[PDB]
Amino acid sequence: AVRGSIIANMLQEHDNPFTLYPYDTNYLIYTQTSDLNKEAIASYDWAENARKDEVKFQLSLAFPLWRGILGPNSVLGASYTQKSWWQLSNSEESSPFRETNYEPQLFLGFATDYRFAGWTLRDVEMGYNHDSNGRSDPTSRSWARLYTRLMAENGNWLVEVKPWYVVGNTDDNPDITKYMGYYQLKIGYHLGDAVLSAKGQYNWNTGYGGAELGLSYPITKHVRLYTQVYSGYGESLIDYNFNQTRVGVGVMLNDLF
Ligand SMILES: CCCCCCCCO[C@@H]1O[C@H](CO)[C@@H](O)[C@H](O)[C@H]1O
Numbered sequence: 001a002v003r004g005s006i007i008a009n010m011l012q013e014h015d016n017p018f019t020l021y022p023y024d025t026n027y028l029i030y031t032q033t034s035d036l037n038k039e040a041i042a043s044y045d046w047a048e049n050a051r052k053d054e055v056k057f058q059l060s061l062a063f064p065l066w067r068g069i070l071g072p073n074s075v076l077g078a079s080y081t082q083k084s085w086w087q088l089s090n091s092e093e094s095s096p097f098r099e100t101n102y103e104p105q106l107f108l109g110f111a112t113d114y115r116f117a118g119w120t121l122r123d124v125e126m127g128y129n130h131d132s133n134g135r136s137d138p139t140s141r142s143w144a145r146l147y148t149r150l151m152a153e154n155g156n157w158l159v160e161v162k163p164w165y166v167v168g169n170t171d172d173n174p175d176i177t178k179y180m181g182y183y184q185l186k187i188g189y190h191l192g193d194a195v196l197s198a199k200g201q202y203n204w205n206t207g208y209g210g211a212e213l214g215l216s217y218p219i220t221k222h223v224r225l226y227t228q229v230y231s232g233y234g235e236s237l238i239d240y241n242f243n244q245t246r247v248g249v250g251v252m253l254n255d256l257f
Pocket residue numbers: 110111112113114124
């Protein structure tokens with residue numbers, strides 16, 4: 001229902017309650033990073049043996065809690081996005097997990113149809129976001145945001161802007177805004193079945209930021225081959241103030257569209 005429209009999709013009712021809805025992309029890639037941040041995870045007794053090659057995966061689902069809460073084509077929904085970095089090959093340390101980032105959202109979303117000279121604004125979503133890595137001190141990190149997510153598409157292009165405003169406790173990382181900025185821009189281009197994507201955040205004041213380019217292509221109707229290159233600050237929470245360049249290759253289910 002409208003290529004890449006999270007909200008329109010959530011409005012589509014499923015006959016099976018266990019058929020969930022995709023929020024963000026879902027994938028699993030084998031990666032190699034330029035620098036593995038041992039400093040921040042020094043507390044760990046495997047830190048020394050930390051390898052730069054990790055299994056990286058992302059899980060992202062949405063659950064409509066209440067359709068039509070604010071008129072038709074509206075929904076009160078939640079989503080769960082998890083990103084994990086895993087020392088799978090690091091057998092010498094019993095394949096530890098370096099970092100996981102738990103990111104649940106609660107939001108009011110609308111499926112819309114506004115014209116922008118070719119573009120159609122399809123999603124307008126507003127909600128609360130919480131992002132933490134479930135760690136005890138000192139490696140603990142977390143922050144909360146109120147955000148708005150906007151998505152417009154024009155032919156082969158998709159654009160999504162997600163500005164936010166920080167709320168709650170930031171003591172695990174009080175300077176996180178320095179590296180993350182105030183929004184996230186996402187762009188997707190459809191070249192036939194090939195999907196090119198870019199996702200980043202950039203504080204125009206401090207010069208810090210991070211980017212993520214991706215290219216995918218269908219292996220089957222449900223699964224795709226996915227190549228990713230991340231470069232910059234803020235890849236994960238434990239590396240929010242750490243800079244690295246990371247390349248990975250793996251499988252993917254849904255891309256942004
Ligand atoms: C900023 C708060 C979000 C506003 C989106 C609420 C969804 C209302 O719905 C919108 O109503 C418009 C009528 O003006 C129609 O032109 C749009 O197609 C429709 O999506």
